[PDB]
Every structure is written in C-alpha cells, then in structure tokens.
From a paper:
Clamp loaders are pentameric ATPases that place circular sliding clamps onto DNA, where they function in DNA replication and genome integrity. Because the sliding clamp is a closed ring in solution, it needs to be opened and placed onto DNA by a separate ATPase complex called the clamp loader. All clamp loaders are pentameric ATPases of the AAA + family (ATPases associated with various cellular activities). Here we describe a series of structures of the E. coli clamp loader in the process of placing the clamp onto a p/t-junction.
The first two are open states that differ in their collar domains (Open-DNAp/t and Altered-Collar), while the latter two are closed states that differ in their interactions between the loader and the clamp (Closed-DNA1 and Closed-DNA2). We first discuss the next on-pathway state where p/t-DNA binds inside the clamp loader and clamp, causing both to constrict around DNA. The primary motion is the pivoting of the A and B subunits out-of-plane into a spiral. The AAA+ modules of the γ-complex and the sliding clamp adopt a helical arrangement that matches the helical symmetry of DNA, similar to other structures of clamp loaders bound to p/t-DNA. The Cα RMSD between the Open-RNAp/t structure and that of the Open-DNAp/t is only ∼0.7 Å. Both structures show that the duplex region of the p/t-junction adopts A-form geometry as expected. Because double-stranded DNA prefers B-form geometry in solution, it must be converted to A-form upon binding in the central chamber.
Numbering used by the authors:
A (entry chain D), E (entry chain B): -2 to 363
B (entry chain E): -2 to 334
C (entry chain G): -2 to 366
D (entry chain C): -2 to 370
DNA sequence: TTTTTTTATGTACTCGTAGTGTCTGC
DNA sequence: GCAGACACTACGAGTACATA
C-alpha cells in the first residue's frame, strides 16, 4: 500500500525537487546559491502567507542538506536518506508541531539533546512548524541555541505570521519571505497537475480557480478537489462557477446603478431577486467593488475601460459621465467596510443590507 | 433527546457526499458551512456511521456489525468528538491535543478513524492551531469533520486545509410547507420566523419549540409601548437573558424592516408584525434609525465575541444611548474605516 | 431469558480480578469505561477490562453448570464485594432485570449492570503473525532493550519497540535517536517477515505480566493491535502507525577499531568516573591507546575524574566523548563476561556487544561539544 | 581570506577585543575605566535591544578579568585564558542559559556552589544570559548572593527588557544600557566585514542593508549573509533591493510627485511599471507613506534628512517648499486609510489603485473636476 | 580583589552603629527606647522600600541584643561578639535567607534549633531575610514557633512586601515600616561617603544622583559607583548627566512636556533617544495616554496624585496648573487617534512620530 | 446588615502520596 | 535473600503569578 490516503491532491503534489517548486524564484535562488557556494546557515525562517509552500521548501532544504551525494542544491530523490525522509522515518530530521508542543518542558528537553551526534545524515535538521504558537518561555529558551548551535544541527523554522515572533528570534535567523503566488503561476500549476492526472477541465474554470484562490496554491488545490468531487470527475466551468460564486448576469451593475441613483426600491428588489437565486453575498460585494473601481478608473482617464465586457461598459461610461468622483469613492469605501464587517453579522444577507442602506444614507434625497 | 433527526433537504447532498467516500477519493477534511440547527450535525453523524461501518451497503450503515452497535451506544475507540466542556462555550487546546496524540495509535476495530468537531467557530486560536497540522497530513484512513456558522470566521490557516461543502437552505416556499407540516400556526408568523432564521428551517422550528417565540412577542409589545414615548429602558426587562444576542438580532431585524418600509421594500423580515414596524417607521427618522440599528448590531457582536462580558451593563448602556440618540440635537456615530 | 448463572469460588478469582482491574474505573471519561465485562464461553468465565486502549481478559475455570452470556458491571463494586468475604466464598451471580445478584450463604448483594453490547471488545481477527515464546526468551528480549525506549519524544514512531520477525528469528529494536538496542533470539519456527511498533505503555504492561517458565506465552500480532496470552491471561494493546527506522543502517558499517575488556571492570570504572561527572550532562571523554583505555570526566566545579583500564585494543589512538548513563545501562543489560566495543571515527557512533555471544547489539551516539 | 567552511557571518565576526566593539562608547569607556582603576563591581546588568553586543561585551569583560597578566582593559590575544574563553568551555566563565534554568531548584544549586574557589584565573565569572526569564523565587534567591557575594565571584547579568526584573535586583547591580547602533556605524562595520572577507560590495547596497537592519548589528550581518546568498557571492544594489522586497525610493518619489501634481495618467503609468517589475503592492503604499512622513519631517525642521536620502535630497526639499502641511496631512491620512482597507479590496492592485485615485481626487489644490453638473 | 578600591560602596559603607543609619529616626528612636527601658516584643518584623536599611537595622539590633555590656541600643564594637557579628560569623546570630530556604524542610530544622540554649549571647537572635517568600507550610511552622517563644530567643524578619505575610504573623510582630529616604538625606549621605572616600564630586552631580535614586540609598550608591566608573575616578557633572541620560526611562513625560511646550525639535530629539534605547512605541503611546488622563484627573481635583507617582509629582502638578483643559482634551484625542492608526503605518517609529507631528500642529509657536 | 470577579494556556512551587532502586543489619 | 528501611524520584493537587 503506497499510502492510499495520499489520493488528496494537496498531499500527493507537494514538490520533491527544487525544480518542481513553482514560483518563489528568489528564495529558491538564494537556497541554491547557499548550498552550492558553501555559505550554509544554521537558522532559516521561511515566513509568508498560508498555502505558499514554506513547509515543502524547508523539507526540500532538509533533503538537500542530508543527501549522501553531499551538500547539493538539487537532491537526488532516490538515495537512502532521500527515500527515508520521504517516508518520514528519518531520525536525523525532527519535525516539531510547535502548535502542539508549545510547552517549555518539551523545548528544554529537546535542546538538552542537541550535543549528541546525528545517527545517519550529516546534519540534525529541526523543522519547527508554526513557530509563532510557542510560549514566550519556549521562545526565550531557543535564543542561546540559535545564536551558537553545534556544527551538526540546523533549525528550519516555518511560520505563517513572522511578526508574532520576538525580535530576538527574528534576529538570529535568515528571513525568507515567501511571495504570494500570482494568478498565472497558480493557473499553470493547476493545468500541469490536472493534465498529469488526466482530468477533464476548461481553461476558464482554471482561471476562475486561480483568481478565487487568493494567491495560494493550497487553496486553489483544495478548490480543485472540491470541484472534482462536485462535478463527477471533470472541472467544468458551470459547476465551479456555481460553487465558487460567480455573477454571470448583470445584476451587479443593475444594483450599482440603482444604489448610485439612491433608488432604495430597486436596490431592495434586486437584493430580493438575488437572494431568491441563492446569490453568494461576498462575491456580489467583490463584483460591486470591481465595478466601482473600473468606474473611477475610467473617470480619471477616458477609454482604458471594461472593454473586456463592452455591453456593460457602455452603461458604465454613462455612469462615469454622471456621478462625481467623491460619491464613487465614498460608495467604494462603504462597500469595502461592509465586506470587512460581513462576518460580524447575524446573516450575510443582513450584512449586505446594512452595507447598501449605509450607502443609500449618504444621498437619500438625491 | 435531540439526535440524528434526518431532514429531507439533506438527501440530495448526503447521497452526493457518501459517493465521494464510496470511490475512496474523498477529502479527509470536510468543513460544512451550515446554519446552526439546520442539520449539519445529523449529516456528519450519518457520514461517520457510513465511514466507521465495517460492512456497509449502499448509502446507509448495516446496523449489525459491532462498529454500528458501539457507535449507537455512544462509545467507540475510533470515534472522537470535540465538543465544548460542560458549562463553557469554548473548545480548549487540551482536548484537541489529547485527541491528536490519540490519533498516533492505530484504529482499534481495524477500520478507519473519525474526528468530529461540533463547531469549528468555537475553536480557541491555540486549539485551532494545534489542529492545523493534524488537519493537513493525517495518518492513513483518518477522517475529519468540521461545522461552522461562517467559514471565513475560522482561522485563515485552518480553513485552507479542508474541502468545504456548503449546505444550501431550502427555498422559502418549501421551508414554509415543511414547518406548516411540523407546526400548526399562522403563515405570516412562520414566514417571519424563517426569515429571522436566515431561511434555515431548523432554527425557526427550534425557535417555535422553545420559549423564544413568547419572548419575541413580549419584546414586540415592549417596543410598541416604548416607540411613541421613548421609554426604551423598559426593553431591558425583555432584553436581558441568557439568549440576549437572539433578541438583539430580532430588534435589528425590526429596524431593518422599518428602514425597508421607509424605502418601500416589497418584502420584509417581520411580516407578522406590521403595526410595530409602521410605528417605528413613522415615529423615528431614518437618520437616527440607522444609528440605532448600527449600535444594536455592534452591541450584539460585542456580546457574542468577548466571553465573560456582562450583559447587564452592555444592554443598559445600549438602551441609554438609544434614548440619548432619540433626543434632537445629538451627534450621531459614523462607521469607521 | 435472564439466565446468567455464574457459579465460581472467590479465592480463584480475586487475583485475576485484581489483575484485569488494574487501571480499573477511576477515570470519569466514560461510564461504560469504568466497568468489567463478565462472559461465559468454553466452559470458562472471561473477565474483561478495557479503557478503549488496553484490554485485559482473565479466563477463570468454572465450577458448576453455567448459562452462557455476557453482561458488564461496575468494576470497583465487584472488586470490593469479593475482597472482604471470609476465606472462600461460593460466588453465585444471577441476572434480574438490569441487576447482578451475588450470593454466598447469607451474603446477598446487588450490582446494577449494563448490556454487553455496549461494551467495546475485540472479536476474532486474522493474526498477521503468531509466536510461541518461552517466558525467559521474551523476558530477556524486552529487558535488554526496555531502557532504550524514547520517553515522550517528538518523533512519535520512536515511542515504543519494533518487533521484527524474520525467518526463524525474532528481534526487538528500541531507540530514541541517541541510544539504540537490538536483541535477536531464535524461535525454531518458520515465520513470515513482519514489523511491529508496540507503544511504551503496552510493552511496560506486557513486561509486568509474564513470569514463570512453566507457562509458554502465545503472541498474536495483527495489522492494528497486539495480543499476548500468558497462561490464562490475555493482554491487548494497539499499534503505532509510524514506521521504525532501518536499524541495520544505524549500526556502523566498518568498525575498524576493536576493543575487548571485562564487563565488571568496565562497569566499575564507568560508575567510578560518573561519581564526579556532570549532574545533567553525565558524559565522559574516552581515549584509546595501545592496550589502554583512559576515561575522564569533570563538572562545572572542575572536579575531574580519571581512570585507566587494561584492555585488548586493536587500532590507532583515538578520542571519543559519550554520555555515561547510556553506557552504564548497556553494560548492566549485557550480563556478560567480556564486553566488545567497536569504534570507527572520533565523530562516529560506538557499538557495544557481548564478546562471547552474538545475540545482542547496542549503539551509543557520542557527544559533539 | 581563510573562511573555513564560512562558519556564519554572525558567529565568525564576534568581537574579541575592547577595540573591536562597533562603538557602544558609553559602556565601553565605563568598563575600561573601571578595569583600569580597579573598581570592579560584583554585579552589573546589560540591557538594550536585540543584537547590540551585550553578550559580546560580557565575554569581553570576562576576558579582561581572567587574563593571566594584570587586570587590564586590553586583553591579550595570546593568553591561555583568553584563547580558551574565545573557544568557549572556559573553566572560570559559567555560561548559564537562564531560560533553561528558570526554576529555583537550579538557582539554589547555583548558590550552594558559589563559595568553592575557582580552579584557575581570579574571578569565577557568572554569566547569566536572559536574566528576565528567571522565576520570581529564583530572583529572590539571587538577592542575598548579589548583595554580599564572595570576594572571588562576579555576576554578569544580561537581558533585553530590564523592566521585568524585580526592582531590588535592579538596585543591587550596576546598569548598562546599550543603545541601538546608528546607520553609519552599521555601514562602516559591514564595509569592514566584507572587505576582510574579500566580497564585492557597493555603497548603495550597504546603505540599504544598514537602513533595513533597524539599528541592530546582528540583523545587519544576517541580512548581509542573506544578500551574499541572494547574489553570486557578491553584494550589489540590485540583489539587496530585490531581497529586501522594496524599491530604492526614487520610483516612490516619482509616485508621490505624480500624486501631488494630480497627474493621474502618470500615476497609472508608474503603477503599471511597478506591476511589470512585480513589486509588492503594499510595499508601494508603505514607501509612499514613508516619503510623505519624511516630507513632513522636513516641513517641521530643515535638518530632518540624513545622508541616506541625500541622493534625492535636493528634490525632497522642493516638495516641502510647496505642499502646505494640511495637504500632506490629508495625503498621509488617505494613504493610511488605503493601507488599512487594502487586505479587503477585491484585488491588491485594485486597492492600491483606488487609494491613489482617492488621494488625487480629494486633492484640494487640484481636485478632480465634476464631470458635467 | 586587587587594591582596596574593589570594595563596593553598597557593601563597605554598611552602617555599624545606630548613629550611622540616616533618615529612619522614627524606627531608630523606638528601638533605642525599647532596648533602654526594657520594653521588648517576641518578634520584630521590618518592612519598607528596597535599600532603605531594613537588613542593616536588623543586624544592628542583633549586635545590640548580644553585647555582654548589657542590652543596649549602642554596641561597643570592641568585644568579641560585636566584631564576630560583622567580621566573620557569630554563632548565636542565625542568618537565614528565607528565599533560599522557602521549603518547610528547612524552617522545621530552624525551629528545631530554637529549643537549644544560646552559646555566647543571652538572646538567641534569628534574622530571616525576605520573609515574604516562605512557603505556606513554613509559615504555619513559624507561627507555631512564635505562639510560645522561649525567653532566650527573639526573631527578626526583614522583607520588602509585607502584604504577602499571613495576618497571624503580622499580629504577633511589631512591624517597623521604613519610609523611602528623602532627596536631601540621600544627597547629604552621598556627599559624606564621597568626601570620606577621597573622590572628587560636584554638587549638581550629587543632586542628580539623589533625584535618580528613586528614594533607595542603595540605588544612589550604585549610581555613584557607576559615575566614578564613567570617567577617571572623578564624579563630574558632565559624566553624571550623560550616564543618567543614557539610563533615563521617563521618555514619555519629558516628551509630553516638549509636545505641550510645542518644541518640535525637543520632541524629535526625545523620539530619537527613545529609538536608541529600543523603546516599544505602542507602550510609549499607552504611557502617554495614561499621563494625559492622570493630568486631566489632576485638573479636575488635586487628589488624583497618589504615592505611586511621587517621583514625577512636581512636574505633573506644574504641567497641570499651567495648561488649560481644552488643550489636554485635544492632545488626548490626537494621541488616541494616532495610536489607533499606529499599527497601519510604514513602521512604528514613523507612525508615532507622525502622531506627534499631528499633535504639534495644534496651537503652534512662531 | 448583606451586598460585590473574565476569560484560555502556560509557568513555577511546594507539599503528600506513591511507586520503586538498594542494601544493612534483619 | 530481604524487607524494611530508607532513599529517591515522579505525579497530582492546590496555589500563585503572568499574558493577551
Ligand atoms: N512552491 C510550490 N510548489 C509546488 N507545490 C506547492 C508549492 N507551494 C505549495 N504547493 C502545494 O501546496 C501544498 C501545501 O504546501 P505547503 O508547503 O504545506 O504550504 P505551507 O507553506 O503553507 O505549509 C503542497 O502539497 C503543494 O501541492
Ligand atoms: N557592538 C558590536 N560590535 C561588533 N559586533 C557586534 C556588536 N553587536 C553585535 N555584533 C555582532 O552580533 C553577533 C552576536 O552579538 P550579540 O552580542 O549576541 O548580541 P546580543 O546583545 O543580542 O546577544 C556578534 O558575533 C557580532 O558579530
Ligand atoms: N538608612 C541607611 N543608612 C546607611 N546606608 C544605607 C541605608 N539604607 C541602605 N544603605 C546602604 O545600602 C546597603 C544595603 O542596605 P540594606 O539595608 O541591605 O537594604 P535592604 O533594605 O534592601 O535589605 C547598605 O550596605 C548601606 O550601604
Ligand atoms: F501554512 Be504554512 F506552514 F505557513
Ligand atoms: F540576543 Be542578545 F543576548 F539579547
Ligand atoms: F535588599 Be533587602 F535585603 F530586601
Ligand atoms: Mg506547514
Ligand atoms: Mg547573548
Ligand atoms: Zn538523496
Ligand atoms: Zn455496520
Ligand atoms: Zn590574556
Ligand atoms: Zn560589644
């Protein structure tokens, strides 16, 4: 049994070689140059937003550090050490789920055993995951070890929130900022993996997944698995559109034109109709934000408009022809605040109603 | 008592979800975005019944194997539940840590393992973080189930590692038919309850079954007395209770409908009580109505969020500030960026 | 029908009942958890106690004609109701509704019960491997490597023993990343190759269960738990899902430097040097020269200790520093006459074994300051 | 140079002489004069921000007090005690990681053995690092020992936040606050280190590293190591600018100039150029806010520009000569609100663009005209 | 060690007669009258501010009680036991650091040593330092001993925090509370030691040392030793001022002084100095808000100033009297808004500086 | 003349109990 | 032995404090 439970894409498609890593070119180049030149450090801190790949990058660094080929920038992936660390049975590599072993007793017990020799590999790599969840005493216990560790031990911290670490911990480590993946990178990676697994898909669906993933490969991959489960083995545009939440109709522009006209009757009728269609309120607010942004953008510079969708942008030119920029700016700010406070509402529909009523109250007479 | 009360609107989804597990390609982590009391617990329970069954058939448990018997008895070495401790509305990191440490050992009955959290929105930050990695890469044949009011309310890191299933509430006509079958009361009040429960039939049914309907009627009467006179302080007698957020939400919905009536919206959340909403609309200007609505919802959010807050002080101050807002010549709050 | 006719004698069950009770109901985790199951089968009464992790069953022989079935009772109540009866007692247990009535002469007592369907228990399962082990063999096997278990370490797979069966040999491997112990013994039985990771608690409970060479032990290992039958007692503990590391790649491959010495002399010397060693860093630096072993130590107070041993050494002069506790433990485990040490490099691990028998092996990983 | 295995820039270049410290003059002079005059107090606490030299200065003092020659402020590099303490594991110095010995059960064991005479040297130097981590009972145990210690025991206490110490502990010992380093000192030290290691460097990259170090030398030196890794073993302006994830002003100065001139087309063009470079959008707002804050600095007082911004100084002054303070207040507030609202924007580029649009549209001197009526 | 100057002023200048303790007349006179007139209690518990003389006065009591020339306030200092108490150790004076011996397993032995007759002196004297750290069971044992004390033993407990002691121990002990030394007394003493130590000094430096002493004479002596260190054996005004400026931590109060004074350059210099020390900026804003709230409370009523802010009482009083309330409210509003906007700033330093610049724009100078 | 306190997690400390190593006249 | 005695070590509980 080759770990059947790995059928989940997020567990099967994690890279095993530096070349397999998508994006993050700066940190990859820095790691490769450090390994090749011999400029090896003892405390790496990969910090970035969630689902970007710092755990996988750290595991690849550990693979490169503990390979029998030597201190190589590209792990072989077939040596005994590489196979063992893939299996997770490698003694010399210690993965600490710091969000669970956050107590200081465990940290002190671990640090009292740093002097001993590694079993097989050259280095005794410490993969401390979710460092920010350690207790303050646990942080302060790490200072002396991180400053001057023995030559056979290396700490590979990996946090999703670097600012919560004490400055004394950030000071001893090489901070690698894992840049959030762009839309194109996510789309290309999703296409590559789906074509590898022979799964039906449409480029538009992949574009929607990449845009709605909010700059994360793990989010995009989880959404892809959700779409696969929903659509019976195919990533179809209609299924992923109904799943993620899309506005194929022009009800967003109608809502904007009703609100900017201070037509509460039309605004509430459109809200009722959209709710009757099971609209996703957050995606709706995002669409209004985009429409208002394009309206202001074309108000500043003529043309340079929603030429992509000519139909609505004509009426958008009318809107930009009438509405003063200050009203557009305040409408956008109020919609954004409503999106921010949408979770803090008894109901999403009620939150959208709050946002639109606040927008109406600015110019209720006109 | 309350148990796996299966609901008809779960039928199209359940048969789907079990399919994702029948092929064996299902995600180990399934976060259910379902409104409270709408049926997420029953669906998760049935899914776990299918999962832990040694000899299942079709889309239901056999009910004969020892796993089914142990599951029915409420004790099972491979069925962990993460629920708030008795008398405390939070899920400590200690319970999550104990469960995660138990997951290291094999399943006793030779089957799979199930870890079900009653409500992921009640996770403490430490507990959710202790569950992060366990969610990410669980051992062979391990299944996680999470339920939430709002997925975006969860931690931005935990929600990433989970296939998210959304349970769509039934259409309003289907829900009102179902509750009319369940409860023999007026259509107006039933529709008002469904709209109050954000369209979730289960929450409206629970509202009618409990004393919350009598409390809502009393609050409506108190509002009727207080709107013309400004004696909002008396509302305290109806507002201060262990279920204060629900009554604050009822008041917020009433203010919603008053603003709608001023704007003339065709449909309202409170259709059963037209007199009170008309009185609120005519007596109170929309400008002050918006401020009162915002303050009421802010107080509701503060009361829900910070644990240990005192209901008496918050509700009394909200009522006094509302009375102050009623008086002319007083500046009104503006939303902050 | 509520038959449940139990007819047993008290003194023949008090020791089994105390044995199966053990960690009896004191944990309020589950009401059913704090209970003991009485079952009738094969002409014998099975007393079962389980806390969802460890299961213990006593198979006590019956006396009078019985009535088959099963029902669970409060464990502490049953333990206390038969521990004070004067000498022998004709325990007659009967079912009445949801009640056990225990009678012996003029002594009638009641215990409210639960049906056996609720009690978690393991039925028959296809064993992956089966051992017929002499008690002395398993006692030596566990004893010589129990000190090498990881005590609550981050690596969860190290929190126990690896029982690896290969051919007609059974091996136990225990390590924590600093010390390692391997003990292999023959069985004279063609057994399929298999690997088992039994947790710390399971092996400790198993170790404090077997005694007396008169009752051979029967070990049944499946894919999810391990059971041990010692005489009429049955123990069951779940397995660890992890994968134990390849120990044959942990032992040094080319131990060029050879040392042989007396076990008693080495043990006495190491204890004498450890008298003045560091309190929490009990590590000695050892120099090997031609037929000479110099062991030195110190403390923060700089109370150095030095001793010289006349050994049979083959190799070049060498320095290596290792902790004293692991080596004292290995020497104590190796109840032998000559200890053979294998050294490769001043940065490499040290092997320790019996010089007169190739049945055990130990690895000590030095200290790099 | 030798650079044996390149044993980290931070660890390799630890100071070894009192003339090698990068300029904590207020504590260096006091320690040198106390050592010269024989006024050797038995307890003093080093405090200050991260990576300034508290532990290094403590090791230097142990060097000076354990030297084979007379007690001097200039320890020799040949002395056996000095060499041992440089390599560590010294007999007299007792490295005590207080974070690993917070429990009073260890401080009592420490106190039980204080009276034993040192094996070598003169003063058994007790170096307690991260003193603020000790438990309350540990501090109270340390109290009477610090008040009247044995004549041959010196206490070397170091921490980061001395305010967490009990006040009587602060009373029993001297206090040395190590100020955060200035930018010029960091730049000079980085130049020295890179020259001694024979690595190519440029002035702008080193100035950027010093600015990003935020006054702590260990941060500067780790950042220099990471920049060496980022380049092909060479420190350049491009490499450091890419690594720090920021733009070297200028571009942001053009951004703010197009903002204040109501040249929305130029604003959009520069945003497109930044997108082509692919810089963090929050970095754009942060840099624009920083430049507006620096212009406010210049507005308050003319002597509010350092040499770091000298490359644009003549330009920057002209900004402070034309923008009224209320207009810069409005600009800063609008950009700050935009940064507040950026994470909730439909896209980060959308949020930055809308922030710039709001900043230019609300410009009082050149507002965006109302379209028709 | 080498050369007599190594003696720390906090140790060498330990008072040896009741005429040497300074500023504690209300306890010295009481002890002298009690010893002379025969009035005596079973136990005497000392308390007060750090470095005021509790341990020194307790040692003086131990000297006085155990002189063979009669129980008297003033010991001769010539005979055997008077010197043995100070130089070397005296058998019948039992000095116990209660912090080192908190566990009952040591106090039990101590009270097993009370039934034995004294060797040299008439009164078996116990001096227990830091008595507020004894364990609860040790407190029970000490109370049991104090319930029926033999006539040949008298206890002496010295502590800094009297509130932690059991009330039943306070009930049987005649507590002597020592007030913090005045600035004038500290200055006169420092001048006395400096003149008698052949160390040059200047009166302004002595006044600065006394003010910075915070009332504890040990702090004054330590700062004196550091001032001698900072320089060449000379207490110069410039060196002392520089050292205090280096060690000063009242950045917030001087900063609000400069802000209300509308001195922008002073505010910027103070921000620079706070940055040099690595002062937490959010903590600085919180402290400033607290100071503004306290000064407003002072404006409402002079009773708002408690003993907690005695060090900065005069400055806050004068800045309250000279500043109208409206400026205080405006500054509080500006600082609160600035703290609200601080996290969303390019960095904390520029954010707090920008808040201060916003505050300075109100009512500026020519 | 009887009346008033928020949580969740972690870190020490001090004491009795509780279980076990070991070894000395029993 | 040996088991008691004694030594010693670990765990729990109860309490106290810190932090956000
Ligand atoms: N740079 C990358 N290259 C390839 N896959 C990636 C990358 N980053 C993330 N992934 C995908 O995301 C999944 C989780 O990645 P992970 O490294 O755990 O992110 P994190 O930094 O948030 O822990 C991986 O299994 C892999 O499929
Ligand atoms: N004043 C300084 N002079 C020279 N190097 C310094 C200085 N401060 C810090 N460093 C560098 O930082 C490294 C560690 O400094 P350290 O003294 O541990 O700072 P900390 O005060 O945080 O413990 C030193 O090896 C040295 O290279
Ligand atoms: N009233 C005082 N008169 C003279 N010296 C004092 C006085 N108070 C404190 N000191 C000085 O401080 C040193 C320590 O004083 P001590 O009385 O131990 O303070 P504490 O109250 O904290 O125990 C003494 O050696 C003495 O030099
Ligand atoms: F989610 Be990753 F470990 F930052
Ligand atoms: F990193 Be230092 F010792 F504060
Ligand atoms: F400084 Be005192 F002895 F508490
Ligand atoms: Mg990770
Ligand atoms: Mg240090
Ligand atoms: Zn390899
Ligand atoms: Zn079944
Ligand atoms: Zn020297
Ligand atoms: Zn005398």
């Amino acid at each position: 049994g080759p770990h059947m439970s790995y059928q989940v894409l997020a567990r099967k498609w994690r890279p095993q070689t530096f070349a397999d890593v998508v994006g993050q070119e700066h940190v990859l180049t820095a790691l490769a140059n450090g390994l090749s030149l011999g400029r090896i450090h003892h405390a790496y801190l990969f910090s970035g937003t969630r689902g970007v790949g710092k755990t996988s990058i750290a595991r690849l660094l550990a693979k490169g550090l503990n390979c029998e080929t030597g201190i190589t920038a590209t792990p072989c992936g077939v040596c005994d050490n590489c196979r063992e660390i893939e299996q997770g049975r490698f003694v010399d590599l210690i993965e600490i789920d710091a969000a669970s072993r956050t107590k200081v007793e465990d940290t002190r017990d671990l640090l009292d055993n740093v002097q001993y020799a590694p079993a097989r590999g050259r280095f005794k790599v410490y993969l401390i995951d979710e460092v920010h969840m350690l207790s303050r005493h646990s942080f302060n216990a790490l200072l002396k070890t991180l400053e001057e560790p023995p030559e056979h031990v290396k700490f590979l911290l990996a946090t999703t929130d670097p600012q919560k670490l004490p400055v004394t911990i950030l000071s001893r480590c090489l901070q690698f900022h894992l840049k959030a993946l762009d839309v194109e990178q996510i789309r290309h990676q999703l296409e590559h993996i789906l074509n590898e697994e022979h799964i039906a898909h449409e480029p538009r669906a992949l574009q929607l997944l990449a845009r709605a993933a909010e700059g994360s490969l793990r989010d995009a991959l989880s959404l892809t698995d959700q779409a696969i489960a929903s659509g019976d083995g195919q990533v179809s545009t209609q299924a992923v559109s109904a799943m993620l939440g899309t506005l194929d109709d022009d009800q967003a522009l109608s809502l904007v034109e009703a609100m900017v006209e201070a037509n509460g009757e039309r605004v509430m009728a459109l809200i009722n109709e959209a709710a009757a269609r099971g609209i996703e309120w957050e995606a709706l607010l995002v669409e209004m934000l985009g429409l208002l942004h394009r309206i202001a953008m074309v108000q500043l510079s003529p043309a340079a408009l929603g030429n992509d969708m000519a139909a609505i942008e004509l009426r958008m030119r009318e809107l930009a022809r009438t509405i003063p920029p200050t009203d557009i700016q305040l409408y956008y700010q109020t919609l954004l605040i409503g999106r921010k406070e949408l979770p803090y509402a008894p109901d999403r529909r009620m939150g959208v109603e709050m946002t639109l009523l606040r927008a109406l109250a600015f110019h209720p007479r006109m | 008592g309350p148990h796996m009360r299966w609901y008809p609107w779960l039928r199209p989804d359940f048969e789907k979800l079990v399919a994702s597990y029948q092929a064996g390609r299902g995600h180990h982590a399934l976060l259910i975005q379902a409104l409270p009391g709408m049926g997420d617990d029953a669906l998760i329970y049935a899914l776990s019944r299918y999962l832990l069954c040694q000899q299942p058939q079709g889309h239901k448990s056999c009910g004969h194997c020892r796993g089914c018997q142990l599951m029915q008895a409420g004790t099972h070495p491979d069925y962990y539940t993460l629920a708030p401790e008795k008398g405390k509305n939070t899920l400590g990191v200690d319970a999550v840590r104990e469960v995660t440490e138990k997951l290291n050992e094999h399943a006793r009955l030779g089957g799979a393992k199930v870890v079900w959290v009653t409500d992921a929105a009640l996770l403490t930050d430490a507990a959710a973080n202790a569950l992060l990695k366990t969610l990410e890469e669980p051992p062979a044949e391990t299944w996680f189930f999470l339920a939430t009011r709002e997925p975006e309310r969860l931690l931005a890191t935990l929600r990433s590692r989970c296939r998210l299933h959304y349970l769509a509430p039934p259409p309003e006509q289907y829900a009102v038919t179902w509750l009319s079958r369940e409860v023999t009361m007026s259509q107006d009040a039933l529709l008002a309850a469904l709209r109050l429960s954000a369209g979730s039939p289960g929450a409206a049914l629970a509202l009618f079954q409990g004393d919350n309907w009598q409390a809502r009627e009393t609050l409506c009467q108190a509002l009727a007395y207080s709107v013309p006179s400004g004696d909002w302080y008396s509302l305290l007698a109806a507002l201060n209770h262990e279920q204060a957020p629900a009554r604050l939400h009822w008041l917020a919905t009433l203010l919603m409908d008053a603003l709608k009536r001023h704007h003339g919206a065709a449909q309202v959340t409170n259709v059963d009580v037209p007199g009170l909403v008309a009185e609120l609309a005519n007596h109170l200007s929309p400008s002050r109505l918006q401020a009162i609505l915002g303050d009421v919802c802010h107080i509701r959010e503060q009361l829900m969020s910070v644990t240990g807050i005192n209901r008496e002080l918050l509700i009394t101050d909200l009522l006094l500030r509302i009375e102050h807002y009623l008086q002319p010549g007083v500046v009104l709050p503006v939303p902050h960026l | 029908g509520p038959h449940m006719k139990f007819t047993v004698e008290r003194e023949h069950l008090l020791k089994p009942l105390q044995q199966v009770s053990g960690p009896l109901g004191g944990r309020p985790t589950l009401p059913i958890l704090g209970n003991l199951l009485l079952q009738v089968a094969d002409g014998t009464l099975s007393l079962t106690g389980t806390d969802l992790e460890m299961e213990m069953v006593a198979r006590v022989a019956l006396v009078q004609p019985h009535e088959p079935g099963a029902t669970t009772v409060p464990a502490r109540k049953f333990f206390d109701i038969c521990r004070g009866l004067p000498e022998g007692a004709e325990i007659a247990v009967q079912l009445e509704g949801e009640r056990m009535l225990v009678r012996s002469g003029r002594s009638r007592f009641s215990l409210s019960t639960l049906p056996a369907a609720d009690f978690p228990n393991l039925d028959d399962w296809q064993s992956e491997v089966e051992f017929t082990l002499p008690q002395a063999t398993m006692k030596r096997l566990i004893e010589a490597t129990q000190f090498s278990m990881a005590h609550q370490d981050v690596r969860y797979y190290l929190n126990g023993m690896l029982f690896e069966t290969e051919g007609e040999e059974l091996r136990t491997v225990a390590t924590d990343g600093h010390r390692l112990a391997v003990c292999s013994m023959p069985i004279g039985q063609s057994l399929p190759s298999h690997s088992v990771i039994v947790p710390r608690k399971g092996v400790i409970e198993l170790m404090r269960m077997l005694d007396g060479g008169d009752n051979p032990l029967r070990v049944q290992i499946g894919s999810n738990n391990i059971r041990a039958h010692v005489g009429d007692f049955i123990f069951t503990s779940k397995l660890v899902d992890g994968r134990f590391p390849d120990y044959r790649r942990v032992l040094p491959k080319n131990p060029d430097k050879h040392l042989e010495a007396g076990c008693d002399l080495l043990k006495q010397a190491f204890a004498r040097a450890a008298i003045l060693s560091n309190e929490k860093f009990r590590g000695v630096r050892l120099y090997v020269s031609e037929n000479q072993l110099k062991i030195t130590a110190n403390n923060p107070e700089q109370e150095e200790a030095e001793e010289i041993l006349d050994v049979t050494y083959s190799g070049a002069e060498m320095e290596i520093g290792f902790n004293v506790s692991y080596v004292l433990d290995v020497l104590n485990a190796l109840k032998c006459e000559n200890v053979r040490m294998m050294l490769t490099d001043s940065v490499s691990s040290v092997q320790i074994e019996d010089a007169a028998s190739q049945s055990a092996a130990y690895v000590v990983m030095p200290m790099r300051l």
